[PDB]
Design a protein around this ligand. Structure first.
Ligand code: 30B
Ligand SMILES: *[C@@H]1O[C@H](CO)[C@@H](O[C@@H]2O[C@H](CO)[C@@H](O)[C@H](O)[C@H]2NC(C)=O)[C@H](O)[C@H]1NC(C)=O
Ligand code: NAG
Length: 563
């Protein structure tokens, strides 16, 4: 079978590598409640995976190429697997877990601090998590380099497309098992599950991070086994690392992809938030289904992109042109989102006054209306109640409603002072709990967003394999492994970490309501002005793509001249 055998082992690693990445996020919430660790330190534990990966990825790629490549992938995979077991050890070494809107009137940090003194189990998760990052280093730079050197004729692109196609399954298997395990209690098998009172919907409930990280670890350990058997074939660092740079086509190409990948990565991280705020439509009904139909199409694009490159005879200049064509199409489709925007959310007490007689320019220092003034209720509390009129209110207490139907279900307030607007005395002022449902005309618009979103992703998916394929050709044959590593480090150090963080900083200015944390001045933002959020999130995302497209035109001219 020649190089085909190697592909099978590599594809298995790709499923394992992606599985490790998704699992940490799918269980991160459970870990915090279980270890009685401070919220601040939590980001740090999540960060542990990234630092391990970034620190060793550039060094290993250059050094790794000289050494045999099949085995190395194996050592790293194997290390990853040990980390997975290492990450979940605490559960086996810790005792049994211990549990411990309104009508108008008319300590966690301390626990962590105690734990911090001397030695605590939170260090174990961090250590183990870092091991996964170290283990990841030789899966893409060393592995991808091997396929290119020994591929026959122009077949390398097609093989890469297949691996990505297989790689997409990783998250799929990971959400099934990941969520399924969450339904299982953390000490399953140890404690009699008939006495545990907390429920999977309960805040207290702690998920099985130990089985969540055990399956990934076991999967990674088993995945390594084929590699060891495989045959080898079917001042040095500083000098070489410099040569990767001062290579006009290559240097701008890495900056070019940092900007484009950041836009895509940034968009993916906040798309659910954007969809929820702009169209009211929740991800609860969206992500649950749209997140599915999407996987095969995204996977289909990756394979098709690889196939298109393989079938046609494409040179290095040709590949770039094809990559640019996807980018032009992606941006044009991306630019279409601005046209399809619903009207701004109307909330009493923020965009407009509680009475609703006239709008207020600034949400801050909003003077309470007469209906609002009669009831003395806290401004900070948030409880979106939808009135008969259709105007959202900050809280039922703020609305002036003093009656409830019982605790059985959202109690349509018997009367609401603000809701019963002048001219409709007969009409009821009762309100229903939950964010006001968006108007029927707007819902139709939503679908337009989702249809283009799937379509845009597919076009992005078509060119997704191109970035990796293009990079190998421009750089000299000797440094292929290193070039990918430097590019991989740059994409996952800035695109991976900086993009969401600066997006959040930029996005927050638009936000109009701040939830009050016990310690933090601002913990979460309840609602964002829709036009401001749309203009800023899409605009920043689009601006990056426009810059990305501009680089391609400059690059194409440069590439054509050299070749
Ligand atoms: C790490 O976690 C992520 C990261 C990014 C994701 C992403 O954004 C895009 C997919 C992602 C990617 O190709 N992922 C994989 C891969 O193979 N990268 S690669 O570099 O190997 C490839 C050869 C070029 C499997 C990950 C391996 C390494 C990531 C490399 C980081 C830089 N990079 C190229 C990206 O982030 C890209 C951008 C999209 C998605 C999607 N999720 C859905 C579902 C769940 C609703 C639809 S699309 N998941 C992602 C996950 C989970
Ligand atoms: C709104 O509140 C009023 C007062 O509690 C409700 O009931 C009556 O008020 C009128 C005028 O005083 C009279 O019919 C009686 O004094 C009250 N008893 C009833 C129930 O008739 C009114 O029904 C409420 N409207 C709602 C629930 O939308
Ligand atoms: C609203 O109140 C009116 C009486 O004013 C009553 O006839 C009607 O059935 C009520 N409808 C709802 C939605 O409770």
């Amino acid at each position: 079978n020649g190089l085909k055998m190697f592909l099978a082992a590599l594809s298995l690693s790709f499923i394992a590598k992606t599985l490790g990445a998704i699992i940490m996020k799918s269980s991160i919430i459970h870990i915090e409640r279980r270890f009685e660790i401070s919220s601040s330190l939590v980001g740090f534990i999540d960060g542990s995976f990234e630092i391990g990966n970034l620190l060793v990825i550039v060094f290993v790629s250059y050094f790794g190429s000289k050494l045999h490549r099949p085995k190395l992938i194996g050592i790293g995979c194997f290390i990853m697997g040990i980390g997975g077991v290492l990450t979940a050890l605490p559960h086996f070494f810790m005792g049994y877990y211990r549990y411990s809107l309104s009508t108008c009137l008319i300590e966690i940090v301390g626990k962590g601090c105690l734990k911090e003194s001397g030695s605590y189990m939170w260090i174990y998760v961090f250590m183990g998590n870092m091991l996964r990052g170290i283990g990841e280093t030789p899966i893409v730079p060393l592995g991808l380099s091997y396929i290119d050197d020994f591929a026959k004729e122009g077949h390398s692109s097609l093989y890469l497309g297949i691996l990505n196609a297989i790689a997409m399954i990783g998250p799929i298997i990971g959400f099934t098992l990941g969520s399924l395990f969450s339904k299982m209690y953390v000490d399953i098998g140890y404690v009699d599950l008939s006495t545990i009172r907390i429920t999977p919907t309960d805040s207290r409930w702690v998920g099985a991070w130990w089985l969540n990280f055990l399956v990934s670890g076991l999967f990674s350990i088993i995945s390594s086994i084929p590699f060891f058997f495989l045959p080898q074939t079917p001042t040095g660092f500083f000098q070489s690392f410099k040569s990767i740079l001062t290579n006009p086509l290559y240097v701008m190409f890495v900056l070019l992809t940092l900007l484009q990948v950041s836009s895509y990565i940034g968009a993916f991280t906040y798309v659910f938030k954007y969809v929820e705020q702009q169209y009211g439509q929740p991800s609860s009904k969206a992500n649950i289904l749209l997140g599915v139909i999407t996987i095969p199409i995204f996977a289909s694009g990756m394979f098709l992109g690889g196939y298109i490159i393989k079938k046609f005879k494409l040179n290095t200049v040709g590949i770039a042109k094809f990559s640019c064509f996807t980018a032009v199409m992606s941006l044009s489709f991306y630019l279409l989102y601005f046209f399809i925007l619903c009207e701004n959310k109307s909330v009493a007490g923020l965009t407009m006054t509680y009475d609703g007689n006239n709008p207020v320019t600034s949400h801050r220092d909003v003077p309470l209306s007469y209906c609002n003034s009669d009831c003395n209720c806290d401004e900070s509390q948030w409880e979106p109640v939808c009135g008969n009129n259709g105007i959202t209110y900050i809280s039922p207490c703020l609305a002036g409603c003093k009656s409830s139907s019982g605790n059985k279900k959202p109690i349509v307030f018997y009367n609401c002072s603000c809701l019963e607007v002048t001219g409709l005395q007969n009409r009821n002022y009762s309100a229903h709990l939950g964010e006001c449902p968006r108007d029927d005309a707007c819902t139709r618009k939503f679908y337009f967003f989702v249809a283009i979103q799937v379509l845009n992703l597919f076009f992005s998916a078509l060119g997704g394999t191109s970035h990796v394929m293009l990079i190998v050709k421009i750089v000299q044959p000797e440094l292929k492994s290193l070039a990918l590593g430097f590019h991989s480090m740059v994409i996952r150090a800035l695109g991976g970490i900086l993009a969401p963080i600066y997006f959040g900083a930029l996005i927050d200015t638009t936000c109009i309501k701040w939830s009050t944390n016990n310690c933090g001045t601002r913990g979460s933002c309840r609602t964002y002005n829709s036009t401001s959020f749309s203009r800023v999130y899409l605009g920043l995302s689009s601006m990056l793509r426009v810059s990305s497209l501009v680089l391609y035109i400059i690059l194409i001219y440069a590439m054509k001249k050299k070749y």
